[PDB]
Amino acid sequence: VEGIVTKCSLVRPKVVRSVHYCPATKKTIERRYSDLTTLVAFPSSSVYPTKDEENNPLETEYGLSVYKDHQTITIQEMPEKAPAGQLPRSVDVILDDDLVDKAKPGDRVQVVGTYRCLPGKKGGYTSGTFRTVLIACNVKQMSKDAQPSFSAEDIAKIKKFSKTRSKDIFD
Amino acid sequence: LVKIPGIIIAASAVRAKATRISIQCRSCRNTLTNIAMRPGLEGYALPRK
Ligand SMILES: [Zn+2]
């Protein structure tokens, strides 16, 4: 998907592995949180441990826990490419670690990723209506003119061009 | 408090009755420990939430 970044969220950390110390028992606990962004998530999958089995309080070890940072951006159809009459169309994009700060509002970007339905909340009734996002696997800037690619032959050609006529090269 | 006399004609096997119980939630696995049980032939209704 190609478009222009209209809004970026803040970069937030999302806990993927929390480590908890029990001062009463001296025990250390680790809990894993799997990435259920577009999967079904039962509530057992999202509980944060606060008590020991016999209700001793746990203290979370922040430095030992693992977080991955998470961002959401919205990509809009580029104004120069949108049909000149009507209102713009957008898509939401989830950026996860390594990809978060790659785009800022007003940037023209390609986002490669998986287009997916997000789960709604638990409920006994549903409209059949699903909220879709693009889960990025790659983000690249339009400025393929702001990053060059020099091979050994290119460098050699440049060096010879500069050495040959180092006087009227400017002209 | 009553005081009565009598002859004992049956004595059941000694069994186990809880004085304190702990219950665990099926989904979040959190526990609700050391609930005190009433003594005697009295039961207990678990919390429904
Ligand atoms: Zn529970």
From Swiss-Prot, chain A:
Intrachain disulfide bonds: none
Processing and modification events after translation: Acetylated by MCM3AP. O-glycosylated (O-GlcNAcylated), in a cell cycle-dependent manner.
Residues found modified as Phosphoserine: S34, S149
Lineage: superkingdom: Eukaryota
Membrane spanning stretches: none
Chain positions found as N6-acetyllysine: K167
Compartment(s): Nucleus; Chromosome
Function: Acts as a component of the MCM2-7 complex (MCM complex) which is the replicative helicase essential for 'once per cell cycle' DNA replication initiation and elongation in eukaryotic cells. Core component of CDC45-MCM-GINS (CMG) helicase, the molecular machine that unwinds template DNA during replication, and around which the replisome is built.
Subunit details: Component of the MCM2-7 complex. The complex forms a toroidal hexameric ring with the proposed subunit order MCM2-MCM6-MCM4-MCM7-MCM3-MCM5. Component of the CMG helicase complex, a hexameric ring of related MCM2-7 subunits stabilized by CDC45 and the tetrameric GINS complex. Associated with the replication-specific DNA polymerase alpha. Interacts with MCMBP. Interacts with ANKRD17. Interacts with MCM3AP isoform MCM3AP; this interaction leads to MCM3 acetylation.
Other facts: Early fractionation of eukaryotic MCM proteins yielded a variety of dimeric, trimeric and tetrameric complexes with unclear biological significance. The MCM2-7 hexamer is the proposed physiological active complex.
Family affiliation: Belongs to the MCM family.
Listed name of the protein: DNA replication licensing factor MCM3
Species this chain originates from: Homo sapiens (Human)
Lineage: Eukaryota, Metazoa, Chordata, Craniata, Vertebrata
Gene designation: MCM3
Parent-record interval covered: 127 to 297 of 808
Curated annotation (Swiss-Prot), chain B:
Disease: Meier-Gorlin syndrome 8: A form of Meier-Gorlin syndrome, a syndrome characterized by bilateral microtia, aplasia/hypoplasia of the patellae, and severe intrauterine and postnatal growth retardation with short stature and poor weight gain. Additional clinical findings include anomalies of cranial sutures, microcephaly, apparently low-set and simple ears, microstomia, full lips, highly arched or cleft palate, micrognathia, genitourinary tract anomalies, and various skeletal anomalies.
Gene: MCM5
Subcellular localization: Nucleus; Chromosome
Origin species: Homo sapiens
Family: Belongs to the MCM family.
Additional remark text: Early fractionation of eukaryotic MCM proteins yielded a variety of dimeric, trimeric and tetrameric complexes with unclear biological significance. The MCM2-7 hexamer is the proposed physiological active complex.
Protein name: DNA replication licensing factor MCM5
Source organism superkingdom: Eukaryota
First and last residues shown, out of full length: 148 to 196 of 734
Task performed by this protein: Acts as a component of the MCM2-7 complex (MCM complex) which is the replicative helicase essential for 'once per cell cycle' DNA replication initiation and elongation in eukaryotic cells. Core component of CDC45-MCM-GINS (CMG) helicase, the molecular machine that unwinds template DNA during replication, and around which the replisome is built.
Assembly, per entry: Component of the MCM2-7 complex. The complex forms a toroidal hexameric ring with the proposed subunit order MCM2-MCM6-MCM4-MCM7-MCM3-MCM5. Component of the CMG helicase complex, a hexameric ring of related MCM2-7 subunits stabilized by CDC45 and the tetrameric GINS complex. Interacts with ANKRD17. Interacts with MCMBP. Interacts with TONSL; the interaction is direct.
